[PDB]
């Protein structure tokens, strides 16, 4: 998080949405769940924040 | 002094489940390192003299 400025990328995509607090935990790699599986999935790879 | 602003714990836990992806499963790691014949040998293979 403290080195973000020093990391150069081709681009960044910002994905915007409203999710229930308890379901925030599903917004991660290696996850399963109603959101992780049917609404919004992330690849098991490196990401920004 | 936690949870004051910018206090963090340097350690974190592994959530190891029996129902997750392989990359997220636990592995036991053993790393062998040899001392290459400085002092007189203490370990040798199954050889005859």
């Amino acid at each position, epitope marked *: 998080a403290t080195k973000l400025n020093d990391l150069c990328f081709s681009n960044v995509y910002a994905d915007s949405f409203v999710v229930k607090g308890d379901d925030v935990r599903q917004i991660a790699p290696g996850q399963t769940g109603v959101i992780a*599986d*049917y609404n919004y999935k992330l690849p098991d790879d490196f990401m920004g924040c | 002094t936690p949870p004051a602003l910018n206090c963090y714990w340097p350690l974190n836990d592994y959530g190891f489940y029996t*129902t997750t992806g392989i990359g997220y499963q636990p592995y036991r790691v053993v790393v062998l390192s040899f001392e290459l014949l400085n002092a007189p040998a203490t370990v040798c293979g199954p050889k005859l003299s």
Partner: antibody
Amino acid sequence: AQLVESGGALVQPGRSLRLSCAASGFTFRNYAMHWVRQAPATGLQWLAVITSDGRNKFYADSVKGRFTISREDSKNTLYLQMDSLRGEDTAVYYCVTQRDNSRDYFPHYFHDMDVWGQGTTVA
Amino acid sequence: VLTQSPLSLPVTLGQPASISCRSSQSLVYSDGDTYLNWFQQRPGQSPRRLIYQVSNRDSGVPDRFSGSGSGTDFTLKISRVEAEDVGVYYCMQGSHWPPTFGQGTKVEIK
């Protein structure tokens, strides 16, 4: 996780019968509930499921529209309302659920079915 | 639809046995897993699970129980069949709704 069925009886074709199943050893509210029946005719036949929130109810075509599945969380009890019973419906009715609710959503509650009651005879 | 074979398995006490299950369709689910389980129902008792996800065993299940398989073709294996292993072994698929069971294999001890 223990399931205890009751309500089995002999009922003439055309009439109705209502089963119940008491749960103990686990939190009833946190699991989906199923009915499965056993007979030489079908072996083990899945009939219906009601989800943990009591909202979604799915039925096998063989009972769809004739049987209704329901639950009373306040009594930790699963029910099955069987209307217009036929001779073909003779079977031992088992109360079935799961121990693992890690993925409490469709269709994952059909994957383990590892908790079974003693079963009650309906004729 | 699941079909098991043999319908009845005549195994001498202390000898190994296996039960076959064949599906009308691949039991590989949309997430790549396979939801093919095996249950044993002992006379006077309800069904209990022994093997799940083709080859995993439930806690409390003797190490003599194992299994393997893929696609449509699955097998339940018992390294040695004991007197207490008498019962009907069912295969179950949860991959395709409605979930289904095989007709069950009656394993008896000779």
